[PDB]
Amino acid sequence: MIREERLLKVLRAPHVSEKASTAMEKSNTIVLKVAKDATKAEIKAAVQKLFEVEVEVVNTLVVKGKVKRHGQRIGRRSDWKKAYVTLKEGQNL
């Protein structure tokens, strides 16, 4: 039982890329940017609550920020978490 504020915080944005598009067409999987401390169970519960779909499994990876130089000054982007969410082959969000 994960409370509604937690569920409303964990999801951040959908991830837009060609690998994501291919996954969504081919394996019924959406790719999301989630909260850095979100767990698989929380992502599953949040997806089901706020998209009223069904989920069988979640796969998570943490992306590491890219070190970038901006006008001769070292700067590092933030690490974020990415989730691969599989839907139960009838949902089609």
Partner RNA sequence: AGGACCGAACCGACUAAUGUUGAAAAAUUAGCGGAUGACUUGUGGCUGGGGGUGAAAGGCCAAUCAAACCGGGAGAUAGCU
Partner RNA sequence: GCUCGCCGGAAGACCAAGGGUUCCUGUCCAACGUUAAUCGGGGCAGGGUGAGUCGACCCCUAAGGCGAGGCCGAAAGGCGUAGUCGAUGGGAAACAGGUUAAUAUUCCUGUACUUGGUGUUACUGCGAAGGGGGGACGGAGAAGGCUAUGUUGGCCGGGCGACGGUUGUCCCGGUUUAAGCGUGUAGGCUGGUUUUCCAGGCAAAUCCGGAAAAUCAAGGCUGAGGCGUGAUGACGAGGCACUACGGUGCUGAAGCAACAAAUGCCCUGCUUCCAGGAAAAGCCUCUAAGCAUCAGGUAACAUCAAAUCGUACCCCAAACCGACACAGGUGGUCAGGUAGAGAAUACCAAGGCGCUUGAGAGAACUCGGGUGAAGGAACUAGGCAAAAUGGUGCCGUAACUUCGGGAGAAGGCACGCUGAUAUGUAGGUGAGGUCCCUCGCGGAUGGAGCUGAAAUCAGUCGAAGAUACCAGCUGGCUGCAACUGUUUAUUAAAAACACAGCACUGUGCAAACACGAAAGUGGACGUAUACGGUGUGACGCCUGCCCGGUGCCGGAAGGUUAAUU
Binding region for RNA (CB under 7 A):
15-20, 23, 27, 29, 31, 39-41, 57, 59-64, 66-70, 81-82, 84, 86
Q: How far is the CB of 6 from RNA (least distance, A)?
A: 14
Q: How many other C-beta atoms lie within 10 A of the C-beta of residue 49?
A: 14
Q: How far is the CB of 78 from RNA (least distance, A)?
A: 13
Q: How far is the CB of 77 from RNA (least distance, A)?
A: 8
Q: From CA 7, how far away is CA 3, in angstroms rounded?
A: 6
Q: From CA 31, how far away is CA 52, in angstroms rounded?
A: 16
